[PDB]
Amino acid sequence: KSPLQQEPSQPSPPSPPICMMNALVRALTDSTPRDLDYSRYCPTDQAAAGTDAEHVQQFYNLLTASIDVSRSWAEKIPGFTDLPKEDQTLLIESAFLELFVLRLSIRSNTAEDKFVFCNGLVLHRLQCLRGFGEWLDSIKDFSLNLQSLNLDIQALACLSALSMITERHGLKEPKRVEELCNKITSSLKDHQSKGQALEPTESKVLGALVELRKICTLGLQRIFYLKLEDLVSPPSIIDKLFLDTLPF
Structure with a gap:
């Protein structure tokens, strides 16, 4: 009598408002x-007196603390949990080095040649030169460029989430990660329109994003040689991360 066909063409009322930007900033500030x-x-601080073995020990201890902080950072993000369990794990392991570097560079001061970690610990430049060496130096150069961009608190909060969230390879539903990426870009996008310019500085971010990636792969390269030496052998969590993650 009355058959149905074609799309329902339902307007679908908009979802209730959300303080997405605030949530990201709140997590960032804490x-x-x-x-x-x-x-x-x-x-x-000259590289000497057990420089290699002692520094390598310090290297994993700092990362162990960093990853737990990164996890808590991811946990504070709204909608993060909604993604499959495996996705959340994959995102954290792959983006752990990136988050440590990104967050470290923002907090650090290149002019002062000092690095401030999320734990409040400061290793100047030479102190981390023992292991990171030129790897650290690259971070300092990156940090200076990042500071030039400025990136407000709200803009920065979305960007840190953006670095954390990205299509990997054997992802749980590429679309779950992408869904969240779009969500961050939604908050971020309105933020970019707040300024008089109304121009998104994303293109500038992408140029520094590539550089940020270089550091992420650089971190893997340095540790690869150190692991061959086995001065102190990496912890299960960090070694697990290396094997779990891929250079590609």
């Missing part, structure tokens, strides 16, 4: 040290 720790901070 994951920063206040007390600060300069007990081991020194103006001069």
Whole structure:
């Protein structure tokens, strides 16, 4: 009598408003040290006296703390949990080095040649030169460029989420990760329109994004040689990350 065909053409009322930008910023502000720790901070530190083995030990200890902080950072993000369990794990492991570098560069001061970690620990430049070496130096150069961009708090919050969220390879539903990426870009996009220019600085971000990626692969390269040496052998979590992640 009355058959149905074609699309329903339902307007579909808009979803209720969400403070997406605020949530990202809130998480970003809490994951920063206040007390600060300069007990081991020194103006001069030459690579010597167990430089390799001791520094390598320091390297994993810092990352172990960094990844837990990164996890909490991801956990604070709204809609992060909604993604499959495996997706959330894949995103964290792949983006752990990127988040550490990105967050470290923002917090660090290139003019002062000092690096401030999310734990408040400061390793100047030479202190991390023992292992990172030229790898650290690249981060300092990257940080200077990043500072030039400025990137407000809200803009920065979306970008850190953007770095964390991206299509990998054996992803759970590429679209789950992409869905979240679009969500971050939605908040971010309105942020870029807030300024008088109304021009998105994403293109500038992508140029620094490639450089950021170079650091991510550089981190893998440095540790690859150190692991062959096996000065102290990486922890299960960090070694797991290396094997789980791929250079491609």
